[PDB]
Amino acid sequence: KSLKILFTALFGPGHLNACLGIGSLLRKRGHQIYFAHFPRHRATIEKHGFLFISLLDYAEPEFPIVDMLPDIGIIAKFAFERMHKLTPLELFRHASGKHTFAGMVNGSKGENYAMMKIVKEYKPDVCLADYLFNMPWMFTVDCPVIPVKSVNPIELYNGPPALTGCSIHDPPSVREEIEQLARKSELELESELEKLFAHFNVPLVSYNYAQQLGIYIYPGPLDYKELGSPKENWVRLDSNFELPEKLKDKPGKLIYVSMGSLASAVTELLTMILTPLANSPHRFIVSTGPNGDSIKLYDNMWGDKFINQVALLPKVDLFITHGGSNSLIEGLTAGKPLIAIPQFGDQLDNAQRIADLGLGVRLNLHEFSGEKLLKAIEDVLNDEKINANVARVSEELKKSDSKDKVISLIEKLARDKKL
Ligand SMILES: C[C@@H]1O[C@@H](O[C@H]2[C@H](Oc3cc(O)c4c(c3)O[C@H](c3ccc(O)cc3)CC4=O)O[C@H](CO)[C@@H](O)[C@@H]2O)[C@H](O)[C@H](O)[C@H]1O
Numbered sequence: 083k084s085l086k087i088l089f090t091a092l093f094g095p096g097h098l099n100a101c102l103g104i105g106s107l108l109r110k111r112g113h114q115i116y117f118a119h120f121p122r123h124r125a126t127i128e129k130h131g132f133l134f135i136s137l138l139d140y141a142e143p144e145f146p147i148v149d150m151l152p153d154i155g156i157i158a159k160f161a162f163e164r165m166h167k168l169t170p171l172e173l174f175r176h177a178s179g180k181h182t183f184a185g186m187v188n189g190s191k192g193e194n195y196a197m198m199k200i201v202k203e204y205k206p207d208v209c210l211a212d213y214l215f216n217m218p219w220m221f222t223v224d225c226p227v228i229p230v231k232s233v234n235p236i237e238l239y240n241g242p243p244a245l246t247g248c249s250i251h252d253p254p255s256v257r258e259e260i261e262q263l264a265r266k267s268e269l270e271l272e273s274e275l276e277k278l279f280a281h282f283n284v285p286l287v288s289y290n291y292a293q294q295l296g297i298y299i300y301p302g303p304l305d306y307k308e309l310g311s312p313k314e315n316w317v318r319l320d321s322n323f324e325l326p327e328k329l330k331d332k333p334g335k336l337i338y339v340s341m342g343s344l345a346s347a348v349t350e351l352l353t354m355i356l357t358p359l360a361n362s363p364h365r366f367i368v369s370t371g372p373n374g375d376s377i378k379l380y381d382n383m384w385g386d387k388f389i390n391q392v393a394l395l396p397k398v399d400l401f402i403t404h405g406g407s408n409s410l411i412e413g414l415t416a417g418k419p420l421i422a423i424p425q426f427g428d429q430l431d432n433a434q435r436i437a438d439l440g441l442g443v444r445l446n447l448h449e450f451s452g453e454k455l456l457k458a459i460e461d462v463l464n465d466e467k468i469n470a471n472v473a474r475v476s477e478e479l480k481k482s483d484s485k486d487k488v489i490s491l492i493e494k495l496a497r498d499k500k501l
């Protein structure tokens with residue numbers, strides 16, 4: 083009856099959360115939880131009572147495990163300079179048939195070898211994995227494997243291409259090109275996946291195929307009901323911060339600013355956003371990121387490298403975000419309107435979904451001005467319809483619950499090896 087359940091995920095701290103939440107639900111039903119990842123996450127995994135397995139302990143000698151987190155600042159700075167210079171359309175034209183994240187595929191060989199060895203050693207009854215793309219080990223190991231998805235799920239539908247930030251309001255003439263480019267770039271992702279799968283002698287699958295079951299986490303009221311149903315076997319899983327003294331005795335609303343764990347490594351991005359907010363008549367709490375001591379703060383601001391974001395969000399009036407999925411769900415669960423300044427990949431889809439459903443505004447780096455940021459703040463704080471829309475979504479998120487259904491499917495698959 084007690085199952086052995088093994089999780090793993092990509093390097094993003096965001097890619098941990100769905101996995102951690104699903105693991106907590108299964109541990110409460112008496113299952114043994116294992117989580118394979120990097121040492122930096124041992125503390126959170128062991129605090130949850132899951133057994134921590136270090137990917138680094140299982141590397142094949144000639145395929146060292148690529149750890150992308152420490153170098154992310156270099157990659158993130160290149161992405162920032164493209165976003166500040168180019169329109170979304172120009173970004174795709176300049177990409178010239180290269181894909182947003184296919185660059186990561188070749189380097190994934192070491193992690194695949196490690197997971198092969200980990201699943202052979204620990205012999206779990208089922209595995210769950212939150213990746214950007216399927217990996218060969220998911221089709222070679224002796225147990226069922228559930229892909230877990232936390233990125234914007236438009237890629238699970240037959241609609242507008244993923245990673246473009248297409249609007250529901252874009253006419254066919256306006257989008258037909260950016261869409262064609264996105265299609266040529268899907269072929270580069272397939273080509274790189276074909277080389278990774280060939281290396282391991284595994285027949286290639288679609289990058290987001292769910293063989294028996296896939297679990298995606300996205301706000302129900304934001305999901306793409308207008309595109310019909312997600313891909314086969316995918317199911318949606320619906321589940322006191324102390325204010326600094328510096329910001330007391332000061333007028334205006336309280337605003338949280340975060341460009342997320344990864345993009346915040348780019349000090350130039352936060353500096354570009356903060357400078358004009360010195361003149362906004364409100365109070366700002368800032369997640370300053372790992373280089374945060376290099377970031378200048380003004381008299382109306384307080385910040386630290388890593389904020390207790392979930393404790394803070396109920397106390398704020400507005401969330402200035404990069405539009406990452408974890409930040410989107412946390413902000414809307416707390417009932418706070420968003421200004422999304424997207425930085426990379428699925429953040430463009432989330433930013434446009436916020437604008438399209440009246441939950442906030444999208445502000446692009448390529449046409450950014452201080453005047454426009456300050457005006458976005460005043461507009462959203464005073465927009466009774468946006469504040470009503472956000473309140474309605476937060477209520478729906480508090481009520482919606484698919485846990486029993488999804489846990490039953492995981493347990494059924496773990497025991498029967500079929501659904
Ligand atoms: C994995 C990387 O692959 C190449 O590089 C490409 C780069 O590859 C990635 C692959 C990824 O999986 C990610 C990435 C870049 O950056 C993402 C990112 C994260 C945070 C940000 O603020 C901005 C961007 C994170 C991610 O998952 O993609 C660019 C287009 O989006 C291309 O122009 C780059 O040739 C290049 O070989 C890099 O040296 C190598 O580290």
Ligand SMILES: O=c1ccn([C@@H]2O[C@H](COP(=O)(O)OP(=O)(O)O)[C@@H](O)[C@H]2O)c(=O)[nH]1
Binds near residue numbers: 099344388405412
């Ligand atoms: O200063 C910070 C930055 C991030 N996070 C948490 O780290 C996770 C990932 O945040 P990020 O914005 O990087 O994720 P994304 O929105 O891109 O998915 C979430 O649970 C956030 O609440 C946090 O607590 N404090």
